[PDB]
Write a protein that binds this ligand. Structure first.
Ligand SMILES: CCCCCCCCCCCCC/C=C\[C@H](O)[C@H](N)CO
Ligand SMILES: CCCCCCCCCCCCC/C=C\[C@H](O)[C@H](N)CO
Lengths: 297, 245, 242, 58, 242, 99, 58, 49, 49, 48
């Protein structure tokens, strides 16, 4: 099927990923070797060029006179399974008796872990993340008091019919996964898989999800990744009548089997909205602390 | 044996005498999709020399009070050449890139530029300033084309993230006393092996002066910056009529 | 009826507990993974990258926050003047808080290993000059003149074709690890100081600009390690999010 | 030892030491990752690498 | 007294939990099984069967619900007119909701693989004609004329002894799987469109009927897969059952 | 008219590429489609009323009383299965009591 | 391993990977079915099968 | 129900009941009910020395 | 559903109990030990003085 | 913006003061005769 020479000698169709680098085992910190004086020409390791964009390859064996230091300090705590396998508050649902937010004994919560600043800033250090999770629900009264009450935690994937009321039909959970728990028992705890249509979630989507003439009205779709809308989480007080205890459900997400790609600058301004990298303009805080002068401390 | 470079891809060529080096992004050279990562069964077209070549977008004037400019990729090549016609006619797209920023000046001019590649560079607003209005940017500012758009708050990069930590990405400097060119090579970075070119901008190119341009009166005041970029290992699939956006 | 008896440590939710939990979906096989470039396997891959140090953290208003990344050098009278000085404590509040080392060492409590600051000159080609970049270890107060600062570790930097130099701040500690310094009892953990002194002067011909600027770039070495993950302290959050 | 291979790390050379009591491998413990780094992917991503003792821009 | 301590995940009933439970009847051996024909082992055996697609979902009254399974073709003026168009999204609300693919993909959330529509001509033997059956991938709006629809995937169908043709709508997606499209943010997952255009005309002699009807039949291929079981959404239930 | 379905592949209709599909068929099985608990019945034990006012209640076993579980089993006409019932008792208000 | 064979799948060539703590095999876990299909039972149930590339009604 | 948060040195100390540090993304925390047995955790040797 | 039945000696905290407890920090490797002189291994070394 | 679509070279003044633009052989014919105004403009080589 190939006769001409401009298709036999072609680099078209090379599928292998030509990598310059090789991951080497680094269980301990790097050991220091002994170094003496140098008084030579041409060999100059203190002089770099950051215009190349690469970082310095300068060791301290080249800059000072050093000793042998067999370093046995581990790199096992900077891994991602040691940095992200730490549960944090991703959501918080309230089930009041009288009110306006959720006055019918049921509550729906669109799954986003971009609603509390302390857990958002960690995952937004990377732009693609692939992880299994482990959710944990911690139900209680506003006063911290525990009561004898039964609840249903339904997971409603996208497309499935969302429950409109307490006595609705979707709560029969024939295919949707559900969890029944009493408030006197320990917190519930389920492990979720990686449920994306893609190969990884992405907390930043530079683009619009639909086609069409992009106008002022349909502007809020900018940044919406529908690969990330994993569904909807719903709660009710299991019953036909109204409850007699106000509740507050807290959700705590722990990651495991984590992988991550393409690090990012970490944020310094205060978040304002969910799934939105907006900020205040007149109040642009600097990253750090100020000084009186540069020569004084 | 390192300050000179000749970049020949396709029917185009760049010759430089004050180069730094060539940065290969994330240790990866651009490639074509494998039979395992691919899911689309349709055969993709691989136009190997008609789109894989250098395109020169525009010229930006560096002044004393220049705050910065950003260009989204491949929004810059949707109305330019055979690349911007295979993309209008196809639904998918997969290409690396080779960016090249030129800024020539004398040996009596001083300044620096940070030329960084930020993937998935979402754009924010000041939210009315007070932070109470839930606003979103318009379309001319998120996908601004080949003309680019000027950063209004470069310290936070118009996204709330700092300019100081941007050196974790791909980057080079343009220090007018050492070099006048920055060659960055970028593979295809996405969760998907193929993706749409008219809706999704995979990365953004940031050109920010850290050190301001200074010169003495009598010299040349007009100091342009010029972006010149080449697709590499491009692939297209899913053929239907032509749509602009 | 296997006999068991419940020990303490029961019906408690420890967030840093790594145990087996109940799946919700059976026989779910997730989407296969493709080759994405940039696989971060360890966070210490990211501390070795050179990020900008905001030594000139004097300007505060929003119109002058880009003046904060570069500090100047000018024509002096050749007395061995002082250009700039900054503490070498990354987890402390100051210039290093604008780095990917000083934001990730906020999520850790105890650090070890060497650092490296990498200054870069952004002046003319026809300009020449020399600087002394001294690391004064702890105990040493702010040096009053250059005659004392040459007693510490130092590098003499000559501007030229290679525009950049590395001062490898070495590991000189009594401890194996050191925690984050702050004002009070915890100043026992300070790493020292780094000063920059005009060795000769910044010489410039006619027709070239009489003032330049230096950009500092901070990173870590291959011996750097961190320990005892925590919550970052040098960033807060005003309420009413969304 | 029959068990579904349905974690988000199946398909990698990384070694894991996990504990599972179910048939679903996404339920397992996090385990011990492999301690492998690739620092020259972010810190020296140049085509033609240069030696320490040499001048970088020759 | 074996020491144990209870972890969280306790005293909860997870419906998708697969564990061992307590039997009520000991030493019960159930009735042996005979050979019954039709053993369904996998539900994907049932998606590959060709079921009728209600392309002509215009009539609404109960007296005209059988007019909904076949769409007509008649004698036109040969300008390349439009016969019918329908979206290729099975989990969406439309023609595919009348299939065993569009009722079983409602019990799943994410689908992959190719489809195939199989049109059948139920006109006279003496009638001849030709049609263009175009799959316009996403981004493409509703084509205004046949000159644009031939740019997508298409098949030219010639009526004859073999009365049926297959348009294999192929798998052209950025993702590996795709979820169910609907109006809004989830239109990102649409599969496209399928239009039918008169290529030449529907030619008929004297004494034969001047109008025919086409029956579309929809199915799936051997590469089709589904994932992430859920509850079906496009069917409800008014209360007071019995 | 033969009644059989199309044997047409996409290797015969368009120009295709090699796509090593590693997508599993393990979630369309019946043990993955029916091993999901659903409400088959619901019994009420009121104090005052007419349905069950004597503190006892009988319920004839039929899983054809709630629409969402009926429609799944009525996709087939013969089914052979072991089951696993689970009883979830509570007050109408959701309150749990010592009973 | 003495245990009663009294599940509703005893008497089939299908392979199952079950967990049981009782003598009654109907109590066991559902397990992993065998991934076998028979699509030509519903989709091509003809006496004399015909090739794809051929015309079906010759 | 109670929350037992361990705040290592440098981490932001909680100033109130409804503060922000109680979200325990990196700080280890323990939730317990008073009706349950006593909590019990094992700490390692955590000194720089 | 492994069958177990709880014996007495349950939900009690015995101070002289030596059992396994739950760690708070995963993958923590503590600071290595140096040679310090005076390693007391048994308290009967101190009664002979 | 249109001229970068053809063959081109980007030339940087420096120590090496000279660059070569190799106008390549892009013709339908094997040989070409001399162009001039009229019917023989069919043989033009292009522009630089
Ligand atoms: C019984 C209840 C179980 C609840 C399970 C909920 C499903 C959770 C799926 C994984 C969640 C990952 C987080 C995904 C990303 C967020 O939506 C971000 N906003 C993405 O930008
Ligand atoms: C201690 C209480 C145990 C309760 C056990 C109840 C026995 C259940 C036997 C199996 C039930 C299968 C469902 C049978 C079919 C329904 O009756 C349908 N109406 C048949 O058409």
């Amino acid at each position: 099927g190939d006769r001409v020479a401009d298709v036999i000698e072609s680099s078209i169709g090379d599928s292998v990923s030509r990598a310059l680098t090789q991951a080497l085992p680094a269980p301990t910190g790097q050991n220091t070797q002994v170094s003496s004086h140098r008084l030579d020409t041409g060999e100059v390791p203190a002089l770099q060029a950051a215009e190349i964009g690469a970082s310095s390859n300068t060791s301290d064996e080249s800059m000072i006179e050093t000793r042998c230091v067999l370093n046995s300090h581990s790199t096992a705590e900077t891994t991602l399974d040691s940095f992200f396998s730490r549960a944090g508050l991703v959501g918080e649902i309230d089930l009041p008796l009288e009110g306006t937010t959720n006055p019918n004994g049921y509550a729906n919560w669109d799954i986003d872990i971009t609603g509390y600043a302390q857990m958002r800033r960690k995952v937004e250090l990377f732009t693609y993340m692939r992880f299994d999770a482990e959710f944990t629900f911690v139900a209680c009264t506003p006063t911290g008091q525990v009561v004898p009450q039964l609840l249903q935690y339904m997971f409603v994937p996208p497309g499935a019919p969302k429950p409109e009321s307490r006595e609705s039909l979707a709560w029969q959970t024939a295919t949707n996964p559900s969890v029944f728990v009493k408030l006197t028992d320990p917190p519930a705890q389920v492990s979720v898989p990686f449920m994306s249509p893609a190969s990884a979630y992405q907390w930043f989507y530079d683009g619009y999800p639909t086609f069409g003439e992009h106008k002022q009205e349909k502007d809020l779709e900018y940044g919406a990744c529908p690969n990330n809308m994993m569904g909807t989480f719903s709660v009710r007080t299991v019953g036909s009548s109204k409850s007699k205890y106000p509740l507050v459900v807290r959700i705590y997400m722990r990651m495991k089997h984590v992988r991550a790609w393409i690090p990012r600058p970490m944020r310094n301004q205060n978040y304002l909205f969910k799934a939105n990298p907006n900020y205040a303009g007149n109040s642009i805080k600097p990253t750090g602390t100020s000084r009186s002068a540069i020569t004084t401390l | 044996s390192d300050r000179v470079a000749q970049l020949t891809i396709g029917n185009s060529t760049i010759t430089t005498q004050e180069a730094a080096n060539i940065i290969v992004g994330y240790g990866e050279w651009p490639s074509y999709c494998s039979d395992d990562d691919a899911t689309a069964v349709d055969k993709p077209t691989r136009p190997d020399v008609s789109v894989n070549r250098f395109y020169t977008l525009d010229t930006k004037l560096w002044e004393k009070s220049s705050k910065g400019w950003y260009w989204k990729f491949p929004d810059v090549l949707t109305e330019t050449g055979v690349f911007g016609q295979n993309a209008q006619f196809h639904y998918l797209y997969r290409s690396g890139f080779c960016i090249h920023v030129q800024c020539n000046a004398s040996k009596f001019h001083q300044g620096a530029l940070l030329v960084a590649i930020l993937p998935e560079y979402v754009i924010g607003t000041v939210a009315g300033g007070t932070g109470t209005e839930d606003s979103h940017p318009p379309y001319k500012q998120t996908q601004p084309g080949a003309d680019g758009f000027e950063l209004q708050h470069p310290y936070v990069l118009d996204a709330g993230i700092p300019i100081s930590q941007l050196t974790v990405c791909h980057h080079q400097r343009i220090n007018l006393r050492t070099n006048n060119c920055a060659t960055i090579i970028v593979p295809y970075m996405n969760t998907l092996p193929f993706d749409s070119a008219l809706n999704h901008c995979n990365f953004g190119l940031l050109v920010v002066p850290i050190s301001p341009l200074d010169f003495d009166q009598g010299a040349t005041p007009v100091i342009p910056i010029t972006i010149t970029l080449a697709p590499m290992c491009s692939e297209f699939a899913g053929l239907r009529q032509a749509v602009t956006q | 009826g296997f006999p068991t008896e419940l020990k303490p440590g029961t019906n408690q939710f420890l967030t840093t507990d790594d145990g087996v939990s109940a799946p919700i979906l059976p026989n779910f096989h997730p989407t296969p993974c493709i080759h994405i470039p940039g696989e971060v396997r360890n966070l210490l891959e990211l501390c070795q990258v050179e990020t900008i140090l905001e030594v000139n953290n004097v300007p505060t208003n929003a119109t002058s926050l880009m003046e904060r990344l570069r500090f100047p050098v000018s024509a002096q009278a050749g007395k061995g003047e002082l250009c700039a000085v900054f503490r070498a404590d990354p987890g402390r509040d100051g210039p290093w808080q604008s780095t990917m080392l000083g934001q990730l060492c906020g999520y850790y409590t105890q650090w070890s290993g060497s650092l490296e600051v990498t200054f870069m000159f952004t002046g003319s080609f026809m300009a020449t000059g020399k600087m002394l970049i001294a690391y004064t270890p702890p105990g040493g107060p702010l040096p009053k003149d250059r005659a004392t600062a040459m007693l510490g570790t130092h590098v003499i930097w000559d501007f030229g074709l290679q525009s950049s130099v590395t001062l490898v701040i070495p590991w000189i500690s009594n401890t194996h690890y050191r925690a984050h310094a702050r004002d009070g009892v915890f100043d026992y953990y300070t790493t020292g100081l780094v000063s920059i002194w005009y060795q000769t002067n910044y010489v410039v011909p006619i027709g070239a600009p009489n003032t330049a600027y230096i950009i500092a770039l901070a990173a870590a070495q291959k011996n750097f390690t961190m320990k005892l993950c925590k919550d970052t302290s040098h960033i807060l959050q005003t309420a009413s999010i969304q | 030892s029959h068990e579904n291979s349905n974690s988000a790390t199946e398909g990698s050379t990384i070694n894991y030491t996990t504990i599972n009591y179910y048939k679903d491998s996404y339920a397992a413990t996090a385990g011990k990752q492999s301690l492998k780094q690739d620092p020259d992917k972010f810190a020296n991503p140049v085509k033609d690498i240069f030696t320490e003792m040499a001048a970088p821009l020759k």
